Design a protein around this ligand. Structure first.
Ligand SMILES: COC(=O)C[C@H]1CC(=O)N(C)C1
Length: 126
């Protein structure tokens, strides 16, 4: 079976809408989401459908852009660092689970290159 997804709603978690978080949605998430290689990363890994019964034995902090998109659209975060960390967890999980040179790793690398380019120009806080 699959684990429950990461949390995307938590009314008692303090949250903010900031210009950096707006950039993370409007620039970073949108750029990666529309990319031809986004699809494996647009929702939690379905270890049942994909026949990866060891996935959640190895990956204990799952993350995906569907979760990140919901967190941004629901104003789940307090700061940009928390969202940046989610993206990096997603990429790292992919590199940890898979073998070098696998298609999925090349896909992650292409998305990560764009991510790094956009993060390099994260606006200063208002
Ligand atoms: C469509 O799913 C794939 O192509 C590979 C799996 C495993 C992995 O790390 N993912 C992000 C999904």
């Amino acid at each position: 079976s699959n684990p429950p997804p990461p949390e995307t709603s938590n009314p008692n978690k303090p949250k903010r809408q900031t210009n950096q978080l707006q950039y993370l949605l409007r620039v970073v998430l949108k750029t990666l989401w529309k990319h031809q290689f986004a699809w494996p990363f647009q929702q939690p890994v379905d270890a049942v459908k994909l026949n990866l019964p060891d996935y959640y034995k190895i990956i204990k902090t799952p993350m995906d852009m569907g979760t990140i998109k919901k967190r941004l659209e629901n104003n789940y975060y307090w700061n940009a660092q928390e969202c940046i960390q989610d993206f990096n967890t997603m990429f790292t999980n992919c590199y940890i689970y898979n073998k070098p040179g696998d298609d999925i790793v090349l896909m992650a690398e292409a998305l990560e290159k764009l991510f790094l380019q956009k993060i390099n120009e994260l606006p200063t806080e208002e």
